[PDB]
Design a binder for this molecule. Structure first.
Ligand SMILES: CCCCCCCCCCCCCCCCCC(=O)OC[C@H](COP(=O)([O-])OCC(O)COP(=O)([O-])OC[C@@H](COC(=O)CCCCCCCCCCCCCCCCC)OC(=O)CCCCCCCCCCCCCCCCC)OC(=O)CCCCCCCCCCCCCCCCC
Ligand SMILES: COC1=C(OC)C(=O)C(C/C=C(/C)CC/C=C(/C)CC/C=C(\C)CC/C=C(\C)CC/C=C(/C)CC/C=C(\C)CC/C=C(/C)CC/C=C(\C)CC/C=C(\C)CCC=C(C)C)=C(C)C1=O
Ligand SMILES: CCCCCCCCCCCCCCCCCC(=O)OC[C@H](COP(=O)([O-])OCC[N+](C)(C)C)OC(=O)CCCCCCCCCCCCCCCCC
Ligand SMILES: NC(=O)C1=CN([C@@H]2O[C@H](COP(=O)(O)OP(=O)(O)OC[C@H]3O[C@@H](n4cnc5c(N)ncnc54)[C@H](OP(=O)(O)O)[C@@H]3O)[C@@H](O)[C@H]2O)C=CC1
Ligand SMILES: CCCCCCCCCCC[C@H](O)CC(=O)SCCNC(=O)CCNC(=O)[C@H](O)C(C)(C)COP(=O)(O)O
Ligand code: SF4
Ligand code: SF4
Ligand code: SF4
Ligand SMILES: [Zn+2]
Lengths: 42, 209, 238, 60, 155, 48, 96, 342, 115, 176, 45, 95
């Protein structure tokens, strides 16, 4: 679509090499993906 | 006008800019993907990333556009969108006293051609965007950090970056020099969940996905 | 003090009269400055034909304010795109010809006197009325209705805890700040807090042009070029 | 011959912190931004918020 | 008694210091501009003995006035190390007293004291040109109350 | 104040104080709250 | 009011007092533990109760706009004098 | 453990390590670094002082708010010590000077007050008193300092049986008065060494290791009662050590012999100064005292701290003494000096 | 899809190439900074620190990513040879004041509740 | 409209040329400056001597905070946390509790005078006029800890400057 | 009652000067040279 | 602290103007620091009837950005008519 030497990269994206997150905070930390619960008092 | 609070509406400007929206769209259908005018009379020119150089030259050089002033060059990092970063240009036309906004999208890896040639003002704005966000700009005269401290790692304005950061500083006497330590707040940032659980604007209601 | 939807509260009684007393005296000091430097030969040589920037490059460099009006470009946001009630106020915009360091010094000093005319009109045409938008969902209600009315207290509570939720959208509003074209790019998701706030600092674009100006000039000139540029590093470092 | 203007010796993360504050709480940021043109600074921010809110200030 | 002559030489030395301390030309941010108003004819800092000498080799009190950030913190401590002895550092304004408005950001050191031994703390955002005018004079009282030779004669 | 005396109330101080920094009357910050988590006091009776 | 701790400290209105060991106590030595004597708890008890005769009574707190939001205390329960939740002033019916 | 002393937070400036230290005489070489490590982990340090508070200002910017609170104490008044060590759990003693002021004899600052802290701390309720005394401490040593330290150790141990006694050898560092002593010797003509200083073997130890030694000793639950001897890795004959110092400083070396009685006379002349003496008769004796080897005494590696050879961190002390000529010269320019090893 | 726009490098190999002249430049750069910056470490003590970053950055495989940090390394090298950094900035690579952090589970368990 | 500022071509008449020649040769604009400063030497200095006389302020001045209390003596703060919720610097930190009397007061009201920037929002926030900055611009301390105010210090400031806050608020309670 | 604000007085306000009021003073250029030569001639004489 | 007339002429002559007409130091001409209590006005919407918010709000009357073309003869049109060159000043032409 660009004719800009489109290399077919396949390896899954990993920018942890650049974001600068320190070693402790990148592997050990576990994130949770969830929809927030409706505040029951509302 | 009976209403004393509502901001007045300028339909003449609204029609005027919308016609120019069809203009720019027809001249460059190769890069322009979407064109819209907001309720407060601002025109957004949604272009494709490779159109950063061609489209900008058109609005800067075409007789009927004559946008010869780079107002600003920003990006709004949206973690949601597939290509998170969204590079935004604002141009002011001295001859036609109008303002235009060309917006393009970009992920972390794909580079955007530097607009230094078409707008020499972009050069320093170019450096800031990479420094704060990490959007690398291709074929730039000198891409370098402009705001963060020397040797500072990470891109601060990126949403995933914490508010306080990772690295603190203090003077340590056994080394007689300022040294960096892991961040350790005497008070954590009290985050506030100050969002109403009730819809605010029926006009801007998203479709029921 | 200047808040969205109007100012916080009305001026104290006798404030405008105090403005009138000062404005009377000021023009008798602005010329006093001009007596000290404007015709001084040492100040002239230190500032004439030095740090000269042309028209197109200044326009291309993203310059604004004095950088444009100093080099001949007759541009001023207060006139071209008047915000607030700047249209109902008559004033002149000094435009230079040489574009150098000196021409801007007169441009700034002449901007002093032109501002005095604006102040004279503002004092003489002050209208009666409130100081904030009547909309209590945007501007907090006065303390009087706070303590007697349900709706005012509810609005004051939410306004100072949650704040007004602005509609989603993005805009870039620029004004003729004394340095130059100060502008903000506010992107709002629709919640009670902004999503992105880019701050167009007039000195940011200016300072990038330091090298283009100081070409062949000595270091003492660079000191002079810094001064005329009127940069304060709170705005540029954001 | 060449002047490299290294800036950043005053980079308070203003545009980062504004993300975490309500619109009213973000006002003093602009006050501190260009600390010699204070009212002009708030005037810029106020006009933008009024534009997005579609609300005009009273004549006074 | 040797205590009497020590005290008399004590009073002579400090009185010279408190009536001739020279605040450096060290301004940072919003907190610096109004400090000029202290040096402006309204309050006239110079009348109290001080002169605003640059060149930390020839200055006594360092007016850290403004936001202290990461990129400059090495520059300040180099500057402070260059100042001869005695040297005092008045942390001026809330930004230099712990971080001020931007206490929680990413490139500001939360407090000028984490780099320098910080003397009397003058608060304000900004402190009025008079507010730290007392701050300077209150330091002059601190200089008055020192012992130095009194400790030396009793060391 | 002689012409217009300020309205007097019970809790208003009767002796103004200068800033007491430096002198041993200076103010030291301290937490004004009670303890959140106490501990299960071990019993006095022996093991058996 | 302000009592004295067994160590010698002064208990505040909240009842905070550093205990015997409490290494934090070092700060108060060579200094003082700032305590406000005008305890709010017992500075409102001695105020008399108004004997106003009605069923619903407003309380501006004095000074109108200088006071607190006007609340209507219901003086109907003939066991306990109604008190404004903002200032603590006790109101009661005049026992019929 | 008291609820306010439970360790909390990752070790840092705002962390609650759980140590309430009472470092005595912290306004000095040794005291400067020990509080820095104590401040780094986060620990209320009482840091009593006697000098002008200005000289304690550099002690301030090494801890969180309200962690380095200062107190005024006098060496001959028990009440001052009791106030300083009242609410604490660890007391570090670093008092002691290398000269003889009219108001403080050598035996005073090494027996009298060190007895006073030792006795009062036990009554108050301290549990980890750590008293510091020279490694070479001998009862019948030629120098009163070395005698006073030896009797000092005896008395504190009696009053406080579970008081860890640290026995450092000569300590080198930026403001050490040991490397600087020989570096400053260049001013008075050549470098005078008795019998060329060829019969005196010294084993110096870097300051930071002993500082970490004290910190680890506090954390270690086995330091109770023990007597550690903090010594460096290598022993150097004094002449070769001075050869190393002047090579690192690149100043010319001009050794010349000097009989012991005449050096003692020179030390007497320098003692006359009513200000900080440069060299006392006692100091001359110390330079002659070779560090006695005490292998039975538990050393430094048992704690966990690995000694840093003086060759590595020597330019720190002596870069200042170099003229502008060899100011940027690195470590590898000067070879390591020969080490008479055990 | 899989087709992505590459920054400078066209596969791993010249991406592997670019990390070399960064190491070529860094290695030549170590001894003069130790002299110019008046560092406390030895000339030998700088090469390892230059080295150890490189295979610390070894799990990276994407050619675009590899070229992205070779620019960051070049910029870091750029901001070093003009003495733009200072002694503190360079020394921040040597984690000196920060005390060693444990690694074994038992030591993690003793200090505090953290993984 | 616009006004040109500096292109004034000088005349070339012999009178004008000699005037400029006299100006350059016999320095005149330099003397014009000297006469200016000398005139501005015999004026009255704008200085004021310190504390013996102090600069002028306005009743709505913003300074050291204070926690006032009702005329009865009961504290105004009912701990609604509005001031904490509006604090731009997040300096306000308060926790409440049902007091022994049953009233709703705060256990802790630490205001960190080293964080907040004297916006004055807090005095606008609480609907009972509880927190308010006093006119006392002067509270400089020698140690960092002294600036970190707790509830007790705030009440003490309220009890000390109560005469000023009652008078100043009385003047400006109508403008707001 | 009556709305009272800080409105300007009924007669607006007095005229405010803004134009430059740089005075012109001094002898004519010919006169300056004339008197300057005159002192020289007297000094020589 | 009024200057003696002898030097009143000196300062006036040395600067070629009348200083005493308007001085930088303020005097009794300043407004009194104590003023009568003001009565502030009410806003236009302080009407106890016919003030429904549905006919008064400003936030709920903003539409989403109008879309004019999406990627999913005509005369050339400028964004706005070209500016009209500013006229020269009347109160003060060329300085
Ligand atoms: C040149 C000196 C010529 C001789 C003295 C005359 C002189 O300078 O008069 C100044 C006198 C004071 O200044 P001003 O601004 O006119 O006073 C305005 C107020 O009235 C001023 O009102 P005020 O209330 O300030 O007036 C009181 C003031 C009045 O002060 C005086 O009159 C000054 C003369 C000493 C008394 O005295 C003080 O304030 C007391 C402190 C005095 C300080 C030390 C003065 C030392 C004088 C020289 C000593 C010897 C050398 O000016 C004149 O009288 C103008 C005539 C000048 C004649 C010059 C002849 C050559
Ligand atoms: C960036 O940020 C900044 C600030 O803030 C952070 C500021 O605020 C300000 C604003 C403040 C200002 C004051 C504005 C001006 C300041 C500037 C930095 C601008 C640049 C300045 C200049 C171009 C001008 C500089 C002028 C100076 C330094 C004045 C010099 C002359 C003087 C008379 C003053 C100094 C006088 C002195 C030191 C006293 C005399 C000296 C002595 C040594 C004492 C006498 C000693 C003896 C007699 C010896 C002993 C012998 C004895 C007693 C004899 C008997 C015994 C025997 C044994 C013989 C600015 C501008 C700023 O940019
Ligand atoms: C013409 C001036 C006439 C009067 C001069 C008085 C002497 C001033 C010397 C400088 C200050 C030092 C002093 O007074 O004594 C030195 C004494 C020297 O002994 P000291 O031990 O007090 O020195 C300070 C502490 N150390 C050694 C750690 C740096 O110092 C002081 O008095 C300062 C306390
Ligand atoms: N190489 C070495 O230096 C070695 C030293 N030691 C011992 O370690 C201790 C500390 O050494 P170092 O830090 O180099 O010494 P310094 O002289 O540098 O510091 C001594 C400290 O003790 C204080 N002090 C001394 N005498 C008195 C007194 N009479 N009253 C009150 N305070 C006093 C000093 O206060 P101030 O500064 O105000 O006088 C200062 O805080 C000494 O006992 C020393 O003998 C042991 C082994 C080796
Ligand atoms: C004093 C301070 C001085 C300054 C101190 C050091 C300052 C910073 C220096 C730069 C650090 C930066 O993060 C990394 C960079 O520049 S580049 C990474 C190269 N990454 C690859 O090339 C792909 C992954 N790795 C491999 O492919 C191979 O494992 C490897 C190349 C390791 C060996 O190759 P071999 O063929 O297996
Ligand atoms: S303390 Fe306030 S006035 Fe001073 S620099 Fe910081 S933000 Fe600006
Ligand atoms: S004055 Fe403003 S910033 Fe300071 S504590 Fe109050 S609300 Fe927060
Ligand atoms: S001080 Fe005011 S805003 Fe804060 S809790 Fe009390 S009443 Fe609410
Ligand atoms: Zn009530």
């Amino acid at each position: 679509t660009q004719d800009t030497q489109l290399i077919a990269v396949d390896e899954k994206l990993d920018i942890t090499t650049l974001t600068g997150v320190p070693e402790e905070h990148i592997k050990t930390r576990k994130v949770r993906i969830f929809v927030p619960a409706r505040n029951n008092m509302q | 006008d009976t209403r004393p609070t509502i901001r007045p509406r300028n339909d003449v400007v609204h029609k005027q800019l919308s016609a120019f929206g069809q203009y720019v769209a027809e001249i460059l259908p190769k890069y322009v993907q979407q064109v819209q005018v907001s309720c407060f009379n601002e025109l957004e020119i949604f272009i494709h990333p490779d159109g950063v150089i061609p489209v900008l030259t058109f609005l800067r050089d075409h007789t009927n556009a004559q946008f010869k002033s780079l107002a600003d060059l920003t990006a709004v990092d949206v973690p949601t969108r597939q290509n998170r970063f969204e590079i935004v240009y604002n141009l002011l036309s001295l001859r036609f006293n109008s303002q235009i906004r060309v917006k393009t999208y970009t992920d972390e890896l794909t580079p955007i051609e530097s607009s230094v040639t078409v707008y020499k003002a972009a050069n320093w704005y170019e450096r800031e965007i990479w420094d704060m966000f990490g959007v690398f700009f291709a074929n730039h005269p000198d891409l370098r950090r402009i705001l963060t401290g020397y040797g500072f790692e990470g891109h601060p304005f990126r949403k995933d970056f914490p508010l306080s950061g990772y690295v603190e500083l203090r003077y340590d006497d056994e080394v007689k020099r300022v040294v960096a330590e892991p961040v350790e707040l005497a008070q954590e940032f009290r985050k506030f969940d100050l969002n109403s659980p009730w819809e605010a604007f029926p006009a801007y209601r998203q479709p029921p996905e | 003090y200047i808040r969205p939807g109007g100012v916080h509260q009305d001026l104290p009684l006798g404030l405008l009269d105090d403005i009138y007393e000062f404005s009377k005296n000021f023009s008798f000091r602005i010329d006093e400055l001009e007596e000290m430097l404007t015709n001084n030969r040492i100040w002239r040589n230190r500032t004439v034909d030095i740090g000269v920037v042309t028209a197109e490059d200044a326009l291309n460099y993203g310059f604004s304010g004095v950088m444009l009006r100093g080099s001949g470009i007759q541009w001023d946001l207060r006139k071209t795109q008047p915000y607030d009630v700047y249209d109902q106020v008559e004033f002149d915009v000094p435009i230079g010809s040489r574009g150098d360091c000196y021409d801007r010094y007169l441009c700034r000093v002449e901007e002093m006197r032109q501002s005095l005319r604006i102040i004279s009109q503002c004092l003489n045409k002050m209208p009666p009325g409130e100081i904030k938008v009547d909309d209590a969902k945007v501007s907090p209600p006065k303390r009087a209705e706070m303590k007697t009315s349900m709706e005012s207290l509810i609005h004051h509570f939410k306004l100072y805890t949650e704040g007004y939720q602005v509609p989603p959208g993005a805009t870039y509003t620029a004004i003729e700040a004394p340095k130059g074209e100060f502008g903000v790019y506010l992107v709002s998701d629709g919640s009670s807090r902004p999503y992105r706030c880019k701050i167009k600092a007039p000195g940011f674009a200016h300072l990038a042009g330091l090298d283009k100006m100081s070409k062949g000039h000595m270091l003492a000139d660079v000191v002079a070029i810094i001064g005329t540029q009127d940069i304060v590093f709170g705005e540029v470092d954001r | 011959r060449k002047c490299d203007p290294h800036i950043g010796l005053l980079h308070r993360g203003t545009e980062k912190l504004i993300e975490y504050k309500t619109y009213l709480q973000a006002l003093p940021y602009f006050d501190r931004l260009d600390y010699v043109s204070m009212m002009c600074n708030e005037q810029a921010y106020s006009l933008a918020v009024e534009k997005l809110l579609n609300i005009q200030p009273p004549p006074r | 008694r040797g205590e009497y002559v020590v005290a008399k030489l004590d009073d002579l030395v400090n009185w010279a210091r408190r009536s001739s301390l020279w605040p450096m030309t060290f301004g940072l941010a919003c907190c610096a501009v109004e400090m000029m108003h202290m040096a402006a004819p309204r309050y006239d800092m110079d009348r109290f003995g001080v002169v605003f000498r640059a060149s930390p080799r020839q200055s006594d009190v360092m007016i850290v006035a403004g936001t202290l950030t990461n990129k400059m913190a090495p520059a300040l401590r180099k500057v402070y190390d260059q100042m001869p002895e005695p040297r005092y550092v008045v942390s001026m304004g809330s930004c230099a007293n712990g971080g001020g408005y931007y206490h929680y950001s990413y490139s500001v050191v939360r407090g000028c004291d984490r780099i320098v031994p910080v003397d009397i703390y003058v608060p304000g955002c900004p402190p009025t040109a008079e507010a730290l005018l007392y701050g300077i004079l209150q330091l002059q009282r601190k200089i008055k109350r020192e012992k130095r030779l009194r400790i030396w004669y009793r060391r | 104040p002689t012409t217009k005396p300020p309205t007097a109330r019970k809790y208003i101080w009767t002796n103004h104080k200068f800033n007491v920094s430096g002198t041993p009357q200076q103010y030291v910050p301290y937490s004004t709250t009670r303890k959140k988590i106490q501990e299960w006091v071990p019993p006095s009776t022996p093991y058996k | 009011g302000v009592r004295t701790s067994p160590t010698g400290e002064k208990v505040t209105h909240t009842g905070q007092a550093y205990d015997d060991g409490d290494y934090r106590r070092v700060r108060f030595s060579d200094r003082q533990k700032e305590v406000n004597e005008n305890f709010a708890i017992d500075l409102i008890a001695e105020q008399p109760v108004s004997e106003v005769g009605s069923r619903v009574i407003s309380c501006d707190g004095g000074g109108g706009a200088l006071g607190h939001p006007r609340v209507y205390i219901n003086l109907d329960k003939e066991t306990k004098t109604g008190t404004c939740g903002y200032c603590g002033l006790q109101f009661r019916q005049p026992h019929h | 453990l008291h609820h306010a002393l439970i360790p909390h937070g990752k070790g840092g400036r705002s962390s609650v390590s759980g140590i309430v230290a009472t470092v005595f005489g912290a306004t000095g070489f040794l005291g400067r670094y020990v509080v820095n490590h104590l401040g780094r982990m986060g620990s209320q340090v009482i840091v009593p002082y006697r000098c002008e508070p200005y000289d304690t200002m550099h002690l301030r910017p090494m801890g969180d708010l309200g962690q380095i609170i200062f107190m005024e104490w006098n060496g001959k008044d028990k009440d001052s010590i009791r106030k300083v060590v009242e609410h604490s759990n660890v007391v570090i003693n670093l008092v002691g000077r290398e000269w003889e002021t009219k108001n403080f004899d050598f035996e005073d600052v090494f027996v009298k007050i060190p007895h006073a802290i030792a006795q009062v701390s036990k009554e108050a309720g301290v549990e980890k008193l750590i008293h510091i005394s020279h490694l070479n401490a001998d009862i019948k040593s030629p120098s009163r300092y070395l005698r006073s330290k030896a009797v000092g150790e005896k008395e504190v141990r009696a009053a406080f049986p579970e008081a860890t006694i640290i026995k450092p050898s000569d300590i080198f560092g930026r403001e050490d008065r040991f490397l600087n002593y020989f570096a400053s010797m260049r001013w008075f003509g050549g470098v005078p060494l008795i019998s060329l200083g060829k019969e005196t073997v010294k084993q110096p130890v870097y300051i930071v290791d002993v500082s970490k030694g004290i910190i680890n000793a506090i954390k270690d639950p086995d330091a109770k009662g023990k007597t550690f001897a903090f010594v460096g890795p290598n022993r150097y004959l004094l002449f070769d050590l001075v050869q190393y110092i002047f090579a690192v400083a690149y100043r010319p070396f001009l050794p010349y012999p000097l009989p012991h009685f005449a050096y003692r006379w020179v030390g007497r002349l320098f003692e006359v100064s009513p200000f900080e003496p440069w060299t006392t008769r006692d100091k001359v004796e110390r330079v002659h005292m070779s560090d006695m080897t005490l292998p039975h005494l538990p050393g430094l590696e048992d704690l966990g701290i690995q000694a840093t050879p003086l060759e590595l961190k020597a330019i720190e002390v002596l870069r200042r003494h170099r003229t502008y000529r060899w100011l940027t010269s690195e470590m590898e320019d000067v070879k390591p000096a020969k080490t008479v090893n055990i | 899809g899989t087709s992505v726009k590459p920054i400078f490098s066209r596969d791993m190999n010249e991406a592997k190439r670019r990390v070399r002249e960064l190491y070529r430049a860094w290695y030549r750069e170590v001894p003069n900074t130790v002299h110019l910056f008046q560092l406390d470490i030895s000339v030998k003590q700088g090469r390892d620190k230059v080295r150890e970053m490189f295979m610390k950055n070894a799990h990276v495989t994407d050619p675009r990513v590899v070229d992205l940090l070779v620019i960051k390394g070049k910029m870091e090298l750029e901001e070093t040879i003009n003495v733009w950094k200072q002694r503190t900035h360079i020394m921040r690579f040597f984690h000196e004041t920060e005390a060693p952090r444990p690694t074994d589970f038992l030591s993690k368990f003793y200090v505090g509740h953290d993984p | 409209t616009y006004k040109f500022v500096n292109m004034r071509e000088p005349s070339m008449d012999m009178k004008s040329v000699t005037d400029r020649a006299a100006q350059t040769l016999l320095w005149t604009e330099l003397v014009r400056g000297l006469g200016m400063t000398l005139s501005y030497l015999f004026r009255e200095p704008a200085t004021i001597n310190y504390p013996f006389e102090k600069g002028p302020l306005s009743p709505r001045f913003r300074g050291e905070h204070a926690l006032r209390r009702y005329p009865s003596g009961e504290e105004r703060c009912i701990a609604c946390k509005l001031c904490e919720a509006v604090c731009p610097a997040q300096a306000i930190t308060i926790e409440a509790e049902p007091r022994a009397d049953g009233s709703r007061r705060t256990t802790r009201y630490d205001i960190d005078m080293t964080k907040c920037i004297y916006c004055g929002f807090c005095q606008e926030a609480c609907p009972v006029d509880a927190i308010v900055e006093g006119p006392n611009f002067e509270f400089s301390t020698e140690t960092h800890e002294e600036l970190l105010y707790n509830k007790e210090k705030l009440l003490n400031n309220g009890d000390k400057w109560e005469a000023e806050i009652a008078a100043n608020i009385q003047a400006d309670y109508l403008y707001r | 009652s009556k709305v009272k604000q800080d409105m300007p007085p009924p007669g607006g306000y007095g005229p405010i000067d803004y134009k430059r009021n740089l005075p012109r003073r001094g002898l004519s250029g010919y006169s300056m040279f004339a008197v300057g030569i005159g002192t020289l001639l007297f000094g020589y004489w | 602290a009024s200057a003696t007339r002898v030097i009143q002429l000196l300062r006036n002559w040395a600067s070629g103007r009348d200083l005493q007409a308007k001085l930088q130091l303020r005097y009794q001409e300043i407004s009194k620091r104590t003023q009568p209590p003001p009565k502030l006005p009410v806003g236009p919407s302080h009407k106890l009837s016919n003030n429904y918010y549905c006919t008064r709000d400003g936030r709920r009357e903003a539409m989403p950005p109008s879309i004019v073309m999406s990627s999913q003869e005509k005369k050339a049109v400028t964004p706005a008519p070209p500016i009209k060159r500013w006229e020269l000043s009347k109160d003060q032409p060329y300085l």
